[PDB]
């Protein structure tokens, strides 16, 4: 097989998810004393399947993990119009006397990779990444409606501006090379995502976030994607490499996981991934609970001493600051 | 003082936990060697406030707390609606024509004990208590809808049955003195609240547990929620003496913090009052997340070994087993 770009997105974004997940696990193994372990599922041609990764109690990642998912499925007009106040373009409406409730069950395809890591050290800090596709089907199996999602974040529990910085310059750069524009909008947008509401903070200095992205060429995001994913590993193992020795109290290990805590608290109230996903009866709970870190804390009122660094770190998380230019 | 059964039921209530809070916190003191400490907060001239025991870092209790909250408002549809769900008797119709609603409110009070307890030791169980009272006013500050709720649970990581025979049989004998229908009814029910649905288990072995009860007279049911409290300290205390000085291995520590990791889903995830408190202005975040203990984890994909005593826990929250003579 030769020339790609001929082919159909669903089945350039798989492939690029794919080809992603291996270099992204390869990359982090690099620099811990464990490697990640697959397992493979499907639902075969009924809808899919997918490749989970993961990696535990390594030298430098607690644990962590790369999946990629692939569905092939029915979407009821019940249920498609639910997923309209997140999705302009999609479409059977139940209308006031018109609409086309074909009833039915509308075809959809959808792929991504999503991944979660958290390091051991707490001056190393978690991260988090997305890229994702959908697409309805026309009787005839091509692309009524579709979007992206996607973004990368960054959770701290000791903020080192230079990590930040590095973080948020690189993904800027990527986004840069096809629109000046998105950056300030999904920098935003991810500031807003990761809004532990009742603590009034975000669980960390946030990245980017976007989804039901759909205002350019599909070709010309999928580039844009590709570019997104080539930020993260310049970034983040060049932050860990530099946080993972460095040495830490039990004290240091007490707030780290008081944040692994607000981490919990914003994947199992906030996240809508999640909480679909644990709702529908035979989903893989163990790969959607992935995301959840190896340990966590709940300290009883607990508030860090004025001036500092924990006390620091929430300055950035109850407000939030710009990291690059 | 004059008869207490003389004064409104939500003062006798108010009165009976205030007291229950002291004697309880005392007599999970007298197995320590740490005290809990109290914490107080005011509404002012809306009424009424709180109070937290606290205890961290004890040699039998890591991490537990006993709270009362007493509270005045005004019930907007934003609930009075939402709480019928619940709550069957609950009042301010905004009808298909007919039935007087409202607009402008309706007066409640409410007021409530609230305590999660969680051991150091792997085989000295988790436990949670709670009772309390809810009523509309009418306009001349009598009770218009009332019910109380509450109940006490069992969470062993170890199961020992003598414990859950105990704990189940003294709870048993509190309700059989009022009623011999209720434990059936309310053992079942807890087993049917604390299920974890994705995990298709409860998160410890039961007790007791209702809501909407308005089925007898209040001052009855006020008896009836004495009796019961008063199975508590009899039962947990006598368990806990005789596990907290058991010893225990880091494989059972993590099985523990394992087992605390499915009490936190249950809380965040499925439990109605702690959702209810995250979401209403004005609440003690701190208050409402104390239930929460002090560290949990989450393996990826743990399983333990046919015959184990681990996986004799997950026989009976599995599949609910009965306890009691």
Same mark, same amino acid.
């Given at each position: 097989p030769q020339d790609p770009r001929n082919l159909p997105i669903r089945q350039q974004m798989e492939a690029l998810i794919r080809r992603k997940q291996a270099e992204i696990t390869q990359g982090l193994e690099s620099i811990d004393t464990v490697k990640f372990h697959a397992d493979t599922w499907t639902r075969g041609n009924d809808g899919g399947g997918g490749t989970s990764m993961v990696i535990q109690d390594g030298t430098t990642f607690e644990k962590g993990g790369v999946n990629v998912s692939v569905v092939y499925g029915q979407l009821s007009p019940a249920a498609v119009s639910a997923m309209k106040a997140d999705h302009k373009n999609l479409r059977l409406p139940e209308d *006031?006397? #018109? /609409?086309? *409730?074909? #009833?039915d069950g509308v075809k959809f395809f959808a792929c991504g990779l999503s991944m979660v890591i958290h390091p051991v050290n707490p001056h190393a800090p978690t991260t988090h990444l997305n890229y994702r596709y959908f697409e309805t089907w026309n009787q005839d199996g091509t692309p009524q409606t579709w979007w992206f999602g996607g973004g990368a974040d960054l959770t701290p529990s000791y903020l080192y501006e230079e990590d930040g910085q590095l973080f948020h310059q690189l993904h800027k750069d990527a986004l840069d090379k096809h629109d000046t524009a998105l950056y300030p909008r999904f920098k935003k947008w991810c500031d807003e995502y990761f809004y532990i509401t009742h603590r009034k903070e975000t669980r960390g200095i946030g990245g980017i976030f976007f989804d +039901?992205? +759909?205002? &350019?060429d599909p070709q010309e995001i999928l580039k844009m994607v590709e570019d997104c994913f080539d930020a993260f590993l310049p970034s983040y193992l060049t932050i860990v490499k530099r946080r993972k020795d460095m040495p830490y109290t039990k004290e240091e290990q007490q707030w780290q996981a008081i944040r692994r805590g607000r981490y919990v608290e914003f994947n199992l109230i906030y996240d809508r991934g999640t909480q679909f996903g644990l709702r529908? *009866? /035979?989903? &893989?709970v163990e790969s959607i609970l992935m995301s959840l870190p190896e340990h966590a804390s709940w300290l009883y009122n607990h508030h860090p001493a004025p001036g500092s660094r924990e006390a620091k770190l929430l300055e950035v998380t109850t407000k939030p600051r710009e990291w690059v230019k």
């Open positions: *006031p006397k #018109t /609409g086309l *409730p074909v #009833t +039901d992205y +759909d205002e &350019r529908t *009866p /035979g989903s &893989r």
